């Protein structure tokens, strides 16, 4: 009841908004601890018919279930308790002072390699927990990802999640279009494909990699179905000048999640085993054959020499290179993107007609207007 | 008309400017003698006259920016102003003269013209805006990218500094 | 595709870079190394150098970061120059043959104490053509390998 809601919490200010759900900050009176409450209008202002009123409850009743199946894990919010009324459904969870990753990705257009590594290190380690418990999300968008004051990822809105029965593969289309895996559309356009399994989350996570490190979705174009053929066919490019400055270890791991065929996809457990997420543990013996020692000393030299060489190569900003090609070189390109999102950062929102790629023009107008 | 043409006719008609842009014009004008739009100057004497956070200064920058009637061209001027701001930080020296914020768009229109001609644009797609003088595709072009509007305006905000500043030094990348 | 081996080779290289077991390589630490190998760059140079690799990192390179560099991002020309450079770094003599003692010279420089025969062995293990010398061709063949 609503009395049970106000006997423990008091909502102070409005944090965010949604289609029918409102996120509101509250104070827990017994503990005086900051907590977020999401306030879903079940009746939805009267627009919801009794079916949607019932369906939203069943979706919400299910929604408590998954958030009740996963708990105590560092990188998904804890549904502290849930209150249901005839007209609302209150869900109290942790307070994330900073907003979604979309808002952050708007502030910093291109998210740096070190920062994304721990971001997704959590997300992949999030993905492992879901797959080990056999629960797929189907909704892994950055707006579904919440960040706290220490930048820690808090995956949010398992609203589209559903627990696969052991060895069962879904058919319903759930998810905003860009972040849908190729067989999501294929199952939508054919009945022979008997469904998709838990490998769906791998593609959605690999999409964040292209968005975070480049500021654009891997496949984006303004009409709806055209994006889909880029997805199922799987035509993606680490285009220039943007994607050449990043290290090569980035590219391969991006392709692994982005393979169109599900069985060859890079599952979460081995996903964390790719060279990017390797960590330097100080206490390792690391024994090596005499050839192995010789490489290390050679590689230690090869490294030092390399670092001097790479740096010597960086071209200081001069008048001419600005005139010929600003985007080509990193410091000016990241700047143009940065002041691109300060002027029109309000023009990026959730959906298809408001994605971040609308703020980037990487192709000639003629090729864009070819068809 | 177009996607960003509808996002620039809705961004320069409301006089929507990024947070602190009026606080960024103050920094630029101290490195210059003024900022001229359609031959209406906003001199550096304003920088001492009102504080950067003074709303009266915001009126002075705003009043100069409505000297262009067409809304979409105003936003082109707006982000053109900022490509001087971001280039001002890189450049150690000061231009020491007037800068026509309008013109930087015009050769940027002209330089946007040349690259698309070379890459295969027809005369039909690159059609002129009747009043402004900017290509309609340039209005529809995205802000960032290889061929974005603020890549061409980060391009034309350097040829104008070529004539006014014979020698320039760019540091801190 | 970098093997468990390769990743491990990068890791021991990161170890050779940091004397302290910090878990990070400082502008000063890199420096101690470059000077160890005879390239003494401005403390400022170092700052820039560690910056080019990291960009945040406050002047410290990390290993996940380290591998990012040691993965062959290098262009054939770019690597070629580098491969060549190390080889020179290897031969103070510049004679062009890798002395067993020259290998020792480098280690001694990097502060790792390893057995004399082992060193000969290190070359011998990798040495066919240059009996007692690793030719540059051997070096390049080896690096790719
Ligand atoms: C490093 C910049 C290189 C081409 C662009 C030229 C910069 C300027 C021409 C002057 C504009 C602003 C000044 C604030 C002081």
Residue numbers in the entry:
A (entry chain C): 12 to 382
B (entry chain A): 1051 to 1223
C (entry chain D): 4 to 148
Text of the article:
Local refinements were further performed for the αβγδ and γδ subcomplexes that display good densities, resulting in 2.8 Å and 3.1 Å reconstructions, respectively. Ca2+-free calmodulin is attached to the γ-subunit in a compact conformation and interacts with both the N-terminal region of CRD and KD. Calmodulin adopts a compact conformation, and is firmly held between the αJ helix and the kinase C-lobe. It assumes an “antiparallel” wrapping around the αJ helix, with the C- and N-termini of αJ anchored to the N- and C-terminal halves of calmodulin, respectively. Calmodulin encompasses the majority of the αJ helix. Over half of the αJ residues are hydrophobic and aromatic, allowing for extensive interactions with the inner hydrophobic surface of calmodulin. Notably, calmodulin also engages with the kinase C-lobe. Specifically, Lys125γ and Arg128γ in the αE helix of the kinase C-lobe form bonds with Asp57δ and Glu68δ in the second EF-hand motif of calmodulin. Moreover, Tyr291γ, Arg297γ, and Phe299γ in the C-lobe–αJ linker contribute to the interaction with calmodulin by interacting with Ala11δ, Glu12δ, Lys14δ, Glu15δ, Phe17δ, and Phe66δ. Together, these extensive interactions effectively tether calmodulin to the γ-subunit.
